[PDB]
Design a protein around this ligand. Structure first.
Ligand SMILES: C=C1/C(=C\C=C(/CCCC)c2cccc(CCCCCC(C)(C)O)c2)C[C@@H](O)C[C@@H]1O
Ligand SMILES: C=C1/C(=C\C=C(/CCCC)c2cccc(CCCCCC(C)(C)O)c2)C[C@@H](O)C[C@@H]1O
Lengths: 239, 9, 239, 9
């Protein structure tokens, strides 16, 4: 068995989309409000997240068939999956050695306590770190990592979606690509596809925990003022 | 969703 | 002639209010998104302005009688006068030597071209600089500088004000203090009170120019996203 | 005016 021409184009276009939207030098980080170590990390992390939301939008626009969807459907998918894509893409900076995200210099080496100093609790950080360790151990190929993010983004089971029949078709077409990629190109990937599909289930509960914690944060004007207009809009509850 | 709309071109 | 006990209390309370809300070390400036020299200065200036809006709110709360007003009236006065107080208070960092605002290190030495690189035109910068040079030459006492800002903030001729009879009383009581302060404590201040009242007229046209320019800026989502939630709220058009 | 309200205590 081997990958069709169409499936190969999907992989190439996604890898190039990731490459365009993920800067491995983390150079743009010096333009955010600086890290400070009561809710001292909120400005830097609001800025980091906002910058990432822009990247996820840029990536989504290059997922074949996403641009063809309704602006409304595109918004619904982005609003509900943005945080999950942030969690997934952050794995590229997550290191098993230090159990932290390392983004450039010594100032952008982020421990779990930083997220604590940014309005979040161990209820979110316990499974976020566990999710990162679990995902890091899968030693995903760039093709799988990028495919998983596109499967996640194209989940039709999102609140707000209208043409969910078209979205389910896009996602299944992408899963066929992943399942085959593993089969043909990943030695000892017998259990991988399932292991990755389970990682999408973990993202849902992590989405849920973040949402609760963010609601509490966003309801305090003294904190919501430290957020950015894009973060407010994307994590907000408007329809 | 002003910003999202713009960002999506 | 000499100042009453009541008028002296007004001066003391205002000077202390200014001292609490104006940090002469400009140390907090390192916490803003950094200066970058298309609309490269917008993040740093959005942050600088937002920080100043917080200061002006802190100051206003210590102006005798302001806290006693309606939350609505307090908002109306703040929304329409905030930019004028920013313009007034910025004079403390304005230098006649370099024709720029000098706030701490070499990175917070701001020339007129910086405001240009932040979405504003020479239609605003020509009179802003002229206003600063004119105000700097008045060599105002700290008492006069602080009194002028409180007169400006307590202008009852603002869109949105309700109990404008009470506000006009507060302002007139403050003008009596200024007029007397100059008379008794300022040698050669024969024309000063009038010269300062004229500076309030200049602030109105500068308010007007900024408002036009800000509307143009805030209407472009790619730019409004670079602003802060407080700036959006204060310079916004909600009632 | 959520923020302004809070900032004014
Ligand atoms: C954002 C990214 C990076 C790290 C991400 C991280 C780890 C950052 C560690 C400090 C992260 C990701 C998801 C959730 C969380 C928890 C905080 C939630 C956001 C705050 C908010 C919006 C106020 O609710 C942290 C760093 C790089 O890998 C880029 C990547 O896009
Ligand atoms: C803000 C302050 C300082 C400088 C102020 C300045 C001069 C800063 C020079 C770069 C200024 C003041 C008023 C208006 C303007 C024009 C820009 C308008 C704000 C931008 C916005 C909100 C997007 O419309 C600049 C510096 C210190 O004196 C503190 C003071 O509160």
């Amino acid at each position: 068995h081997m990958l069709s021409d169409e499936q190969m184009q999907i992989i190439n276009s996604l890898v190039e989309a990731h490459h365009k939207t993920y800067d491995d030098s983390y150079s743009d980080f010096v333009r955010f409000r600086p890290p400070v170590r009561r809710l001292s990390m909120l400005p830097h992390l609001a800025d980091l997240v906002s910058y990432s939301i822009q990247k996820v939008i840029g990536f989504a626009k290059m997922i074949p068939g996403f641009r063809d969807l309704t602006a409304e459907d595109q918004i619904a998918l982005l609003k509900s999956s943005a945080i999950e894509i942030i969690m997934l893409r952050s794995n590229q900076s997550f290191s098993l050695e230090d159990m932290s995200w390392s983004c450039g210099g010594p100032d952008f080496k982020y421990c779990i306590n930083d997220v604590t100093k940014a309005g979040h609790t161990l209820e979110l950080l316990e499974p976020l770190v566990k999710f990162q360790v679990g995902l890091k151990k899968l030693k995903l190929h760039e093709e799988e990592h990028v495919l998983l993010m596109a499967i996640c983004l194209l989940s039709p089971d999102r609140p707000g979606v209208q043409d969910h029949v078209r979205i389910e078709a896009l996602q299944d077409r992408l899963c066929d690509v992943l399942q085959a990629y593993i089969r043909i190109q990943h030695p000892g990937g017998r259990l991988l596809y399932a292991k990755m599909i389970q990682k999408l289930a973990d993202l849902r509960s992590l989405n849920e925990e973040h949402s609760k914690q963010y609601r509490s944060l966003s309801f305090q004007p003294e904190h919501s003022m430290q957020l950015t207009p894009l973060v407010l809009e994307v994590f907000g509850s408007e329809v | 969703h002003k910003i999202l709309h713009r960002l999506l071109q």
